[PDB]
Design a protein around this nucleic acid. Structure first.
Ligand code: ATP
Ligand code: MG
Length: 247
DNA sequence: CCAGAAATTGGCACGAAAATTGCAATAAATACAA
């Protein structure tokens, strides 16, 4: 279960409901730990293809020298040492969703190779002759400022225009103050059962302290703080002093 | 008989198709050691 109790978050949820049945690539931008993975999996879940694979990938974990071999696949005998034919991630997520986390780590050649497939919709194996057609829905998430990347000369402008048809910008947690308290009480329970420590809630002073801290890690930092508070406590209530050192 | 007209020939051209040549080292089945 997730928490959406802020007007901006509710509007984003309505946008997700409207868009989840479309057939266009989605780009999710935001700060660190805002919930981009949550938004991507919520888009996939509320979809007509929710019973299909959701291939999540990190583009920085794929070496350049074999990049196009991983994404598209190769045939037997394509290169020395190719024991047997193998498929790519595009065919693996055929009929489902392909999620690319931190899309800003791509190189220019990889960007062009991805743009060709996103435009045409069909590709070829590394050592193949027939042409493969796929039905992959592409979601891409990043935390960089993509406009500054394209202005500097690091991200292809046409690729950004192709991907940036729909923009979902999750606001920072510091602009979601009315969402801070329901989140903390959500985490405090989850760890309390997990670590078997007994605790009920936060005192008024601790709740006042929570709303004043300008979170830089957004939801993940709040989760870490709540986990530390649960671990380093034994009483039924968390007070100002327990969180004062953490903050 | 003659001069104009018609027929013959082969050199050059042009697009296409066929033949020739450069490349030089791997892949898989099999037997043996822990
Ligand atoms: N509404 C929510 N309710 C509960 N937990 C949430 C909610 N939104 C986000 N989280 C939690 O926030 C954590 C970090 O979020 P997420 O995985 O989406 O990060 P991210 O935005 O992709 O981060 P990064 O930009 O650093 O890659 C997750 O563990 C997730 O459970
Ligand atoms: Mg992420």
């Amino acid at each position: 279960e997730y928490v959406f109790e802020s007007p901006k978050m509710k509007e984003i949820l309505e946008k997700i409901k409207k868009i989840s049945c479309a057939e266009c690539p989605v780009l999710i931008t935001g700060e660190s730990g805002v919930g981009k993975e949550v938004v991507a999996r919520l888009i996939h879940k509320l979809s007509d293809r929710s019973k299909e694979p959701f291939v999540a990938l990190n583009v920085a974990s794929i070496p350049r020298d074999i990049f196009e071999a991983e994404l598209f696949g190769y045939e037997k005998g394509a290169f020395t040492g190719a024991v047997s034919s193998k498929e790519g991630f595009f065919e693996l997520a055929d009929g489902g969703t392909l999620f690319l986390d931190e899309i800003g780590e791509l190189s220019l050649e990889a960007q062009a190779k991805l743009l060709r497939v996103i435009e045409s919709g069909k590709f070829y194996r590394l050592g193949g002759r027939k042409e493969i057609e796929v039905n992959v829905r592409i979601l891409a998430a990043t935390n960089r400022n993509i406009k500054e990347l394209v202005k500097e000369g690091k991200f292809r402008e046409d690729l950004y225009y192709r991907l940036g048809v729909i923009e979902i910008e999750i606001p920072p947690l510091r602009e979601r103050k009315e969402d801070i308290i329901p989140l903390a009480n959500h985490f405090l329970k989850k760890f309390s059962r997990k670590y078997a420590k007994e605790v009920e809630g936060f005192t008024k002073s601790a709740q006042e302290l929570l709303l004043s801290y300008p979170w830089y890690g957004n939801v993940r930092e709040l989760k870490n703080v709540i986990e530390r508070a649960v671990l380093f406590s034994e009483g039924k209530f968390i007070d100002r002093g327990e969180l004062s050192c953490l903050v």
